[PDB]
Design a binder for this molecule. Structure first.
Ligand SMILES: NC(=O)c1ccc[n+]([C@@H]2O[C@H](COP(=O)([O-])OP(=O)(O)OC[C@H]3O[C@@H](n4cnc5c(N)ncnc54)[C@H](O)[C@@H]3O)[C@@H](O)[C@H]2O)c1
Ligand SMILES: NC(=O)c1ccc[n+]([C@@H]2O[C@H](COP(=O)([O-])OP(=O)(O)OC[C@H]3O[C@@H](n4cnc5c(N)ncnc54)[C@H](O)[C@@H]3O)[C@@H](O)[C@H]2O)c1
Ligand SMILES: NC(=O)c1ccc[n+]([C@@H]2O[C@H](COP(=O)([O-])OP(=O)(O)OC[C@H]3O[C@@H](n4cnc5c(N)ncnc54)[C@H](O)[C@@H]3O)[C@@H](O)[C@H]2O)c1
Ligand SMILES: NC(=O)c1ccc[n+]([C@@H]2O[C@H](COP(=O)([O-])OP(=O)(O)OC[C@H]3O[C@@H](n4cnc5c(N)ncnc54)[C@H](O)[C@@H]3O)[C@@H](O)[C@H]2O)c1
Ligand SMILES: Oc1cc(CCc2ccccc2)ccc1Oc1ccc(Cl)cc1Cl
Ligand SMILES: Oc1cc(CCc2ccccc2)ccc1Oc1ccc(Cl)cc1Cl
Ligand SMILES: Oc1cc(CCc2ccccc2)ccc1Oc1ccc(Cl)cc1Cl
Ligand SMILES: Oc1cc(CCc2ccccc2)ccc1Oc1ccc(Cl)cc1Cl
Lengths: 268, 268, 268, 268
């Protein structure tokens, strides 16, 4: 077997060993994939964690907010996999919001300067990444970002909701350019996963109206999800991501696949 | 490899060699699957066509409108794969509408007796099939019906649109019962495929406001679909179906996957 | 003032004094409207209740399941408002499901014969009514059915969910024919109202997993609804219906307006 | 009559005599409303145009991008309508995008600095405006922004699509705070209107793949809209806005009303 068998996917956004990107990559390799990898500020950290995957694989420094890594990235990657070689898949799995736009901080008190920031990171960078990586992808390719149903408002998620909505729209336009290169572009709207990022929020709000309202929300997934949802286990979202990087969903783009155990399709 | 490797899926709804069910099954076997198969009125016909797949495989007589085939079907199937054996996947891919509810016949002139009929067939039978087949499916299973975005009205499709809307809703409830058995239930909303059924409509309307309005509609997919759509080629929808019968979308149910090349996500 | 000022709307589906149709009609008249009215089996009953509105107004016998009332209805109505006169609005607000397709009865055990029945009533009859009433409506008209978001599955509602999904689709096609006559056609997706019908379900299920699961559901609206929801008070849904029968939403059709206090737009 | 009868709505975003805000205000006054009004850079211009409405009414200077007009606005407005007085409605109808994020300029070449800009204006400012205006609104109030279905990607609209998606999400959260004050918050998703802004795009792209692709798009509305769409006539969108500022849609918030003649509900 080998779903991603001798395919070449740069997975981005790893920063610990239950980061979503991570279990994507793990499952990716269990699966013949052959990965490049990007990381943010503390490379050495990421670097340390990456060292834990089945097989070894290159890591390059990507601060989505500055165009020299943007401008160089396809050079570097082709360096990483050898000139006369092309990307088969790309995994966007970054995302970020100033503490002031989330959890308990009131919605109206987040200042555009910080909103601008996490949009920049969570939404726009899906496009910048696609701009730079597409010139080196093969026909039949696949780009995949990570999504959280921004479709209906909920507590705490606040402005990130707003930036995931932007995301969904950007993904749509990305799929128009992706089309020219023969390339698919989609998001996976994951149910909640226990993650560095998940606990930045769940932590940075603790004892207010929050270690609660969001608590309900949480149990709200497993209750609603006909086949259940286990926030502890990332692999189902990673398999879902793999499915889109594969060739087995050839006819789908500009689109969102919901890996949340059916929750979003259920009212209770 | 072998995406459906030694899995056991009853595929229903085959009636020619570019029926959707067919290319599902083909790709299914190319893929270790091991199929039972059901057919409607002219079994001998279907029987004749089936004979053209990679590997041999059992066919049983299923008129979704009568409960003795419903009542017997799990017996028969377990006969077909051997007592102490269970279904891994089920493919609903039947659907039907009295000529009077479609193409050029005015919308208001279709009588409930005929509407009742094709709903019965197109929508409800997704449930009856799930009722009878679930008691013999394994944890980790997957049911998959076939869908055509009924989300927004269009010309000709008329009442079938209405029955696909019912379908989407039924699929949702099916996924609640499926959940108890560890089972996934989803639809693939295909873009248009050139099919016996497609030409029953496109034929039964020809030269009126129709060999046209629906003509536009048709080219409306390839125009809109960022990675294009080729109505001649069923396999992408079959691969998509396979992906859902696989284990690679573990965390998705009560849901619709759009195999239409991105069209539904695009306005033009 | 007089939002529906000297307009002529046949409101159907009244059967008590907190039926939805009722408060539509009340508010309709408070509002210059001038109503015809239809009723189902016990006319004398409805007849008794109707007698409680601001102004007097004609009532005709409409069993949506038989075409002689269908075939005669525009005659009768024009009789009711005087030849050389035309309908300005129509309010469909009927709907019905055999006890066996709802509350606690398992989903898989409802037989198509009963499903067929309540679809027939809940969904198709929106079309039959539009067929017969449109030939006598004025340009600028407005048809309005009643809807309950069938968009996402929930407990108890079972097959009615399925028939509201059909409804939404039918409304879409109705708006295509409505268009020819200058006529708008839309639904109002109400939040839950305490009603004869609401208690047929809530009653016919009482003490099982139901006086509960649906109980949650209920409080689920007021919790989710940013401006709150009071299941005791029909008038907000009636005002919403009036707004669509008015001229103040001129540019909207094939569409659903959510009168549920924002609930459907909120996750919690 | 007088739908907005002795109500007090600040309408923003006027800049000519077929600006959307304008016909909102016109219809608003035809309707007893009593308006304050805000304008952007050339006040004198707006000032000149405003002078053309039925009744006279105050205008204040609002550059949504600087918090001294934000910080002062409720002072000024209460000055404008007299201390011990409160807003009944608010109309957000601003929106803006750097030429580089739209029409023919490729999607990937728009730089975050300009995206940030028009989001800031088109989306975020719905919140800042709600922050400052809500402390002076009455229970029963109504805020209304302007929307263009960002739901599905299309040509030219490019990043504005992205900012309308943000908008929809922000509106959802706004309706949560609005709820506390008894206040409704919604958008009207208009079909296309011939407007200063519409021609900034249609003009700034002319003879490329655009005076065309967008041309189709345009005729795409009237074709699809069962009751038709006339891009020349703003009033139907203004009436729709009025309906939401009224009291006749009491039970709807966090929501979008489509004034596009049914187009969005139709495929063709
Ligand atoms: N965990 C969940 O329940 C959940 C659910 C749905 C979607 N998501 C999304 O999945 C994605 C991954 O998040 P996660 O849960 O794995 O969080 P995580 O903390 O594991 O990952 C966040 C990643 O974003 C990177 N990042 C932040 N700013 C960056 C920048 N300037 N440039 C490059 N990288 C940057 C971080 O370094 C880190 O690798 C995000 O888009 C998130 O919104 C998470
Ligand atoms: N071809 C397309 O573009 C298209 C697009 C989306 C969805 N679909 C859906 O896919 C499914 C398959 O259709 P297709 O295009 O392959 O058509 P097809 O003619 O190939 O298949 C129709 C099948 O339904 C069966 N059938 C009819 N009545 C039956 C009954 N009473 N009991 C059991 N089987 C019965 C027929 O015998 C036949 O096998 C249908 O649900 C259709 O609505 C088709
Ligand atoms: N109450 C709610 O929370 C709720 C919410 C959303 C939508 N609805 C919908 O509103 C509509 C009205 O229901 P309601 O709550 O006022 O219930 P109700 O009991 O007040 O009204 C039901 C009406 O349907 C009529 N009816 C049944 N079969 C008929 C037939 N064969 N021909 C003609 N009329 C027939 C009944 O006689 C009765 O007047 C229904 O479509 C229902 O689905 C109700
Ligand atoms: N015309 C259409 O077909 C269409 C369709 C749907 C939605 N809309 C939306 O309707 C709204 C109004 O646009 P329109 O067609 O009337 O365009 P318009 O040119 O008439 O209005 C644009 C307004 O935005 C104001 N504006 C720009 N930057 C501002 C800022 N910094 N602060 C305050 N005001 C600022 C302008 O001064 C002007 O009054 C926009 O949100 C637009 O996106 C337009
Ligand atoms: O988009 C995300 C979504 C979740 C789960 C969403 C959630 C579910 C239930 C309650 C609260 C939040 C966690 C982390 C996510 O990513 C974030 C959040 C905040 C920051 Cl600063 C960065 C990233 Cl990646
Ligand atoms: O659901 C279907 C959908 C299509 C393609 C839909 C379509 C696309 C473009 C123009 C017209 C129809 C073809 C066949 C379909 O199935 C049918 C249609 C009619 C009948 Cl009688 C039976 C079946 Cl299975
Ligand atoms: O469509 C409806 C919707 C409701 C409220 C929906 C609901 C909300 C919360 C819990 C359960 C049901 C009540 C009645 C409705 O109409 C019905 C239901 C059953 C029958 Cl037999 C007839 C009618 Cl009109
Ligand atoms: O959101 C809008 C939407 C339209 C109509 C949308 C459209 C329809 C058909 C073809 C192209 C664009 C016009 C103007 C709109 O507002 C804009 C656009 C650009 C700028 Cl710079 C400012 C504003 Cl308010």
């Amino acid at each position: 077997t080998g779903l991603l068998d001798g395919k070449r996917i740069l997975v981005s956004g790893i920063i610990t060993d239950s980061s979503i990107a991570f279990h994507i990559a793990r499952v990716a390799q269990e699966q013949g994939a052959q990965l490049v990898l990007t990381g943010f500020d503390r490379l050495r950290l990421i670097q340390r964690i990456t060292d834990r995957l089945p097989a070894k694989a290159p890591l390059l420094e990507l601060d989505v907010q500055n165009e020299e890594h943007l401008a160089s990235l396809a050079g570097r990657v082709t360096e990483a996999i050898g000139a006369g070689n092309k990307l088969d898949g790309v995994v966007h799995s970054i995302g970020f919001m100033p503490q002031t736009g989330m959890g308990i901080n009131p919605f109206f008190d987040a200042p555009y300067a910080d909103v601008s920031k996490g949009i920049h990171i969570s939404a726009y960078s899906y496009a910048s990444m696609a701009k730079a990586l597409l010139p080196i992808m093969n026909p039949g390719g696949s780009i995949v970002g990570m999504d959280f149903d921004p479709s209906r408002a909920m507590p705490a998620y606040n402005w990130m909701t707003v930036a995931k909505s932007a995301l969904e729209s950007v993904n749509r336009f990305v799929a128009r350019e992706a089309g020219k290169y023969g390339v698919r572009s989609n998001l996976v709207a994951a149910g909640p996963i226990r993650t560095l990022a998940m606990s930045a929020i769940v932590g940075g709000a603790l004892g207010e109206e929050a270690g609660a309202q969001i608590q309900l929300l949480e149990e709200g997934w497993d209750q609603r999800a006909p086949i259940g949802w286990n926030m502890k286990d990332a692999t189902p979202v990673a398999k879902t991501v793999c499915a889109l990087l594969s060739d087995w969903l050839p006819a789908t783009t500009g689109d969102i696949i919901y890996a949340d155990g059916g929750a979003h399709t259920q009212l209770l």
